[PDB]
Design a protein around this ligand. Structure first.
Ligand code: 17F
Ligand code: 17F
Ligand code: 7Q9
Ligand code: 7Q9
Ligand code: 7Q9
Ligand code: 7Q9
Ligand code: 7Q9
Ligand code: 7Q9
Ligand code: 7Q9
Ligand code: 7Q9
Ligand code: 7Q9
Ligand code: 7Q9
Ligand code: 7Q9
Ligand code: 7Q9
Ligand code: 7Q9
Lengths: 187, 187
């Protein structure tokens, strides 16, 4: 705690020194910023005037392109309205024919699909009956060759625990005194 | 280990029974699948025939409108050129005016970018001459603080280590000794 008290004492001394030193440079820097600020406002009017001139030219062009925009808009509009009228009848026709085809397709496969799913249903059911027999037998044997393990694993773990306790207990006691023996040095 | 051996002993026995049983079901499932697939091969043709019908229809329809779109596209190809010719002239008019604007814009900043460099250097030179003297004091006083920083840092650590080793070395002994005992029981 010696260094802590000394460091806090030496600091304030140079603290004021560096403060005044930085303050001096700060003051000088402000002068530089002040002159620079003035220059910024000096060229401002010149940049403003030039900008106004630019705007005038751009607005003039906006007015010139206004009528042309309307004309080109009409020319483009007149193109689609002519084409759409010649493409609609063809599309309208084929759409109905396609739609009707899908419906007929579904109706055609309906009876075929119905019989297939019906025949397969019985097939799967017959197979299930046989499988269930063998399945049941396997289930009963599965549990028989399962419970036997844990039944002898649990008691063995308890016995093991009882044999480690004595050694651990004595070790814990030494750990306590050892731990606190370190705290004294740290603190 | 005997517990797990008992599990492995009757393992393959049960597996062999179930595996052979499942193999028997395989042949049954195979026969069922073959008899099902045989019928599915009859349903397919009826779908293909229907699909192939509409396919040819669409093929002919598509061919019918083939040159029809060409007539429309041809007009679009020409109308395209028309709109371009009526818009280009105006763009060119402003294009020349744009380049003329750049000429003035460049010459308007050219001299400033030079004087800006002059003022910048003058400011830096003056600042350097001023701060150059304080930079030395900043370092001089900083080093003095550094000496009072890393002085009693190392010596204190050496003393701390000496008052720990004789206690830690003895702790490892008890730890390692107990380890061997636990291993014996666990193994
Ligand atoms: C250089 C880069 C540009 C400037 C960066 C710093 C800008 C200012 C900000 C912090 C400065 C450092 C501040 C360090 C802690 C200072 C703590 C202190 O002394 O407080 C008392 C006074 C006043 O402080 P405040 O201005 O914070 O006012 C506090 C008051 N309660 C309120 O908020 O109303 O102090 C003062 O008036 C002047 C103190 C001068 C200390 C020495 C001077 C400290 C100034 C700069 C260096 C600080 C670190 C020095 C060591 C490392 C570098 C060598
Ligand atoms: C049970 C399912 C989950 C655990 C599965 C563990 C599978 C084995 C994995 C590691 C054990 C071996 C770990 C390495 C042991 C040291 C190496 C050894 O001696 O291997 C002996 C032989 C031959 O070699 P490996 O099989 O080990 O393979 C090559 C070997 N590792 C090498 O280095 O080349 O393999 C064997 O004897 C089989 C040993 C295991 C028998 C089954 C051991 C099974 C586990 C426990 C049984 C004993 C305890 C029973 C009571 C408690 C039950 C929870
Ligand atoms: C580089 C290796 C250094 C090894 C030694 C330790 C570091 C020494 C270096 C600098 C030390 C600076 C002082 C550190 C604390 C010294 C003891 C001390 O003052 O205790 C007391 C100090 C009181 O601080 P405050 O007056 O701000 O109180 C704030 C409110 N609470 C927190 C007190 C409730 O505690 C602190 O300042 C920390 C919050
Ligand atoms: C020059 C070498 C020796 C060290 C010199 C000082 C180095 C810088 C010290 C601290 C960093 C901040 C410096 C600038 C602010 C100083 C004042 C300050 O608020 O410090 C931070 C704090 C202030 O505590 P106060 O109770 O005064 O509250 C002030 C208002 N605020 C900050 C709470 C909003 O105190 C500390 O954090 C402990 C150090
Ligand atoms: C060639 C590279 C360098 C180019 C430098 C160009 C010139 C730069 C000079 C100054 C920077 C711009 C200054 C004008 C915008 C300031 C924006 C800003 O954040 O103001 C922040 C703050 C605003 O303060 P107030 O809202 O109270 O009113 C303005 C300041 N006065 C008039 C009250 C003092 O400033 C101050 O308080 C005083 C410093
Ligand atoms: C590396 C450079 C990056 C920046 C490039 C573009 C620099 C600016 C472009 C050209 C420089 C000259 C610009 C001239 C017009 C400036 C317009 C401007 O900002 O007014 C800024 C400000 C605007 O408010 P006023 O109070 O003026 O008027 C009312 C508000 N309205 C209507 C103007 C939105 O007015 C001032 O601050 C007074 C000086
Ligand atoms: C790959 C695309 C190539 C396109 C090239 C440029 C094509 C230019 C064609 C048209 C330009 C846009 C015209 C937008 C208005 C169309 C108005 C119109 O269609 O009147 C004809 C009819 C009814 O139109 P309405 O005015 O009653 O309703 C739509 C328009 N309003 C009302 C919302 C403004 O609609 C049709 O016959 C289309 C099924
Ligand atoms: C070998 C390939 C196996 C994978 C592809 C199988 C393709 C279809 C052929 C055979 C599969 C088995 C068909 C027979 C058993 C069907 C079992 C089943 O869950 O029926 C499910 C369901 C049963 O009928 P519903 O849910 O309609 O009930 C009656 C109607 N209401 C009361 C619900 C309104 O029918 C369907 O969901 C049709 C999809
Ligand atoms: C390699 C030979 C051993 C193979 C064992 C695995 C294969 C077993 C063969 C067929 C059956 C597999 C599915 C059933 C396995 C479990 C059978 C059994 O009764 O376990 C025992 C028990 C059964 O419980 P429940 O079926 O009455 O259900 C109760 C509610 N919860 C838990 C289902 C939400 O469950 C447990 O004790 C917890 C694990
Ligand atoms: C390598 C270990 C593999 C462990 C799983 C395969 C071997 C064990 C399988 C089956 C064991 C069958 C014989 C079990 C004899 C001991 C039975 C026993 O003590 O039950 C003890 C206890 C009984 O609890 P409850 O009957 O009130 O059931 C409550 C609902 N739950 C928790 C069962 C979902 O349940 C447990 O302690 C474990 C959750
Ligand atoms: C690697 C060099 C040798 C390190 C040997 C370490 C021997 C002890 C092992 C772990 C403890 C490390 C403590 C590190 C911080 C020491 C200073 C410290 O924080 O004291 C205090 C710290 C926390 O516990 P405290 O009791 O102080 O605070 C909470 C309880 N009360 C106070 C609210 C009632 O103590 C520890 O965290 C454990 C000692
Ligand atoms: C939007 C769906 C309309 C459905 C009803 C109409 C279906 C028939 C209409 C078009 C089908 C494709 C016709 C293909 C033969 C005519 C192609 C043709 O125009 O050659 C004339 C001309 C040039 O054809 P190119 O083959 O040289 O194309 C340019 C080169 N690259 C890009 C092909 C490498 O066409 C054009 O310049 C573009 C309009
Ligand atoms: C309202 C009408 C405008 C909107 C609807 C347009 C419908 C037609 C759309 C695309 C196809 C027709 C595009 C316009 C007619 C093009 C006629 C033509 O020159 O074919 C051939 C032409 C060959 O082009 P090159 O690759 O040899 O390059 C020539 C030089 N430049 C242009 C690259 C500088 O193809 C093209 O230039 C690509 C467009
Ligand atoms: C509301 C308005 C909506 C849009 C309306 C658009 C109306 C016009 C339609 C499409 C716009 C693009 C038309 C492009 C036609 C291109 C015709 C063409 O290049 O012939 C070829 C001719 C020479 O091509 P070169 O490759 O030798 O030179 C130009 C390209 N390089 C060389 C500079 C890379 O083109 C020129 O000489 C241009 C100076
Ligand atoms: C944050 C404001 C308060 C603190 C301001 C501290 C200003 C710098 C401190 C002292 C002025 C610079 C002294 C440079 C020589 C002493 C060592 C040193 O500083 O190394 C840091 C730095 C570079 O030093 P050198 O380029 O000499 O490199 C090492 C020497 N050899 C290998 C190049 C031969 O210093 C500077 O860049 C000068 C600004």
């Amino acid at each position: 705690s010696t260094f802590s008290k000394l460091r806090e004492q030496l600091g304030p001394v140079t603290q004021e020194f560096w403060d005044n030193l930085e303050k001096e440079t700060e003051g000088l820097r402000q002068e530089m910023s002040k002159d620079l600020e003035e220059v910024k406002a000096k060229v401002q009017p010149y940049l403003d005037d030039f900008q106004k001139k630019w705007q005038e030219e751009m607005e003039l062009y906006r007015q010139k392109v206004e009528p042309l925009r309307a004309e080109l808009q009409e020319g483009a509009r007149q193109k689609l309205h002519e084409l759409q009228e010649k493409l609609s009848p063809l599309g309208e026709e084929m759409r109905d024919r396609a739609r009707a085809h899908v419906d007929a397709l579904r109706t055609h496969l309906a009876p075929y699909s119905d019989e297939l799913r019906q025949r397969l249903a019985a097939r799967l059911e017959a197979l299930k009956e046989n499988g269930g027999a063998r399945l049941a037998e396997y289930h009963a044997k599965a549990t028989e060759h399962l419970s036997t393990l844990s039944e002898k694993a649990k008691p063995a773990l308890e016995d093991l625990r009882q044999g480690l306790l004595p050694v651990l207990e004595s070790f814990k006691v030494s750990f306590l005194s050892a731990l606190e023996e370190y705290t004294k040095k740290l603190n």
